[PDB]
């Protein structure tokens, strides 16, 4: 009965759901040689193997998750070439933006364990330190980082200056098919309009490029209810105050600006608000 890969059996007397998933996190790579030949004569298993380990993640707290994300990135330590396609597979589910399994809490502990990985060398620390610099930026359950927006008009405001039990930040490009879904799909959520007429929510769009012109012609898409400013100085852009790689993007801050959601989906801002209201 010898297989590419082995999941450990989970014993009966663990009858506690809590328990199961538990076990099944931490012991998930207990049958995997990480100094093995299985990352080229077998890449279509190992990264099922991977997608299938980010799955069962979701189902324990945050703080054992991000444990075991870290021992496993220790663990491929034993050979470069095993680490550099594991920390791979990690960009390429839980950082890129075209990811629907993207989860920058399970990410952070990757960049974590290679900025202190014995076998990359100084060049190859660069882009982790960089991304764990910028994840901790707008990072979840920390205050969002202040800027000065300017409206049509040239009338200028900061994000701190306005005061709602929430904010929700709407990071939009003009033109772009992706940023007229999500106009839509905030338009369409029927939490979003009540909040906004009560004045317990504030929509602040930002456009943080250049093309200033295509702003101005595309503006009209954009509701009168919300606040929608553009980036001067473009200061966001320059000093990377929030992560572009993904346009559009949306935040839901608390009273203080704390994060709530970050790089979250309409239905995921939606349905937090009507739990919460």
Same mark, same amino acid.
Request: hydrophobic share 40%; aromatic share 10%; charged share 25%.
């Given at each position: 009965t010898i297989k590419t890969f082995t999941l450990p059996a989970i014993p009966q007397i663990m009858v506690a759901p809590e328990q199961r998933a538990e076990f099944l996190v931490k012991h998930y790579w207990d049958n995997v040689? #990480?100094?093995?030949?299985? +990352?080229?004569?077998? $890449?279509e298993i190992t990264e099922q193997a991977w997608v299938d380990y980010c799955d069962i993640l979701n189902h324990v707290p945050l703080k054992?998750?991000?444990?075991?994300?870290?021992?496993?990135?220790?663990?491929?330590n034993v050979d470069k070439k095993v680490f550099a +396609?594991?920390?791979?597979?990690?960009?390429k589910y839980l950082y890129d933006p075209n990811s629907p399994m993207r989860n920058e809490e399970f990410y952070i502990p990757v960049l974590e364990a290679m900025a202190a990985s $014995?076998?990359?060398?100084?060049?190859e620390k660069v882009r982790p330190k960089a991304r764990l610099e910028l994840a901790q930026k707008n990072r979840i359950g920390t205050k969002a980082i202040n800027f000065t927006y300017t409206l049509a008009s040239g009338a200028q405001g900061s994000l701190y200056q306005l005061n709602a039990d +929430?904010?929700?930040? #709407?990071?939009?490009?003009p033109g772009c098919h992706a940023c007229?879904?999500?106009?839509?799909?905030l338009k369409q959520a029927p939490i979003i309009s009540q909040l906004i007429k009560e004045?317990?929510?504030?929509?602040l769009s930002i456009y943080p490029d250049e093309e200033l012109d295509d702003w101005r012609?595309?503006?009209?898409? #954009?509701?009168?209810?919300?606040?929608n400013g553009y980036d001067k100085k473009f200061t966001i852009k320059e000093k990377q105050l929030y992560d572009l790689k993904a346009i559009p993007t949306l935040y839901l801050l608390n009273k203080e600006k704390t994060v709530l959601l970050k790089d979250a989906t309409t239905q995921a801002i939606e349905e937090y608000l009507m739990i919460h209201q």
């Amino acid at each position: 009965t010898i297989k590419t890969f082995t999941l450990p059996a989970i014993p009966q007397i663990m009858v506690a759901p809590e328990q199961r998933a538990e076990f099944l996190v931490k012991h998930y790579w207990d049958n995997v040689n #990480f100094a093995d030949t299985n +990352y080229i004569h077998h $890449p279509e298993i190992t990264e099922q193997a991977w997608v299938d380990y980010c799955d069962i993640l979701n189902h324990v707290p945050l703080k054992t998750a991000q444990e075991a994300i870290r021992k496993t990135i220790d663990r491929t330590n034993v050979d470069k070439k095993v680490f550099a +396609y594991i920390t791979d597979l990690a960009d390429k589910y839980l950082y890129d933006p075209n990811s629907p399994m993207r989860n920058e809490e399970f990410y952070i502990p990757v960049l974590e364990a290679m900025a202190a990985s $014995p076998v990359l060398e100084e060049i190859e620390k660069v882009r982790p330190k960089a991304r764990l610099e910028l994840a901790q930026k707008n990072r979840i359950g920390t205050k969002a980082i202040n800027f000065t927006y300017t409206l049509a008009s040239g009338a200028q405001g900061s994000l701190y200056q306005l005061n709602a039990d +929430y904010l929700l930040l #709407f990071i939009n490009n003009p033109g772009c098919h992706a940023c007229t879904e999500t106009i839509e799909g905030l338009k369409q959520a029927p939490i979003i309009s009540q909040l906004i007429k009560e004045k317990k929510l504030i929509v602040l769009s930002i456009y943080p490029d250049e093309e200033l012109d295509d702003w101005r012609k595309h503006l009209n898409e #954009f509701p009168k209810e919300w606040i929608n400013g553009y980036d001067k100085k473009f200061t966001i852009k320059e000093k990377q105050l929030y992560d572009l790689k993904a346009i559009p993007t949306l935040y839901l801050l608390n009273k203080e600006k704390t994060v709530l959601l970050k790089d979250a989906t309409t239905q995921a801002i939606e349905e937090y608000l009507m739990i919460h209201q």
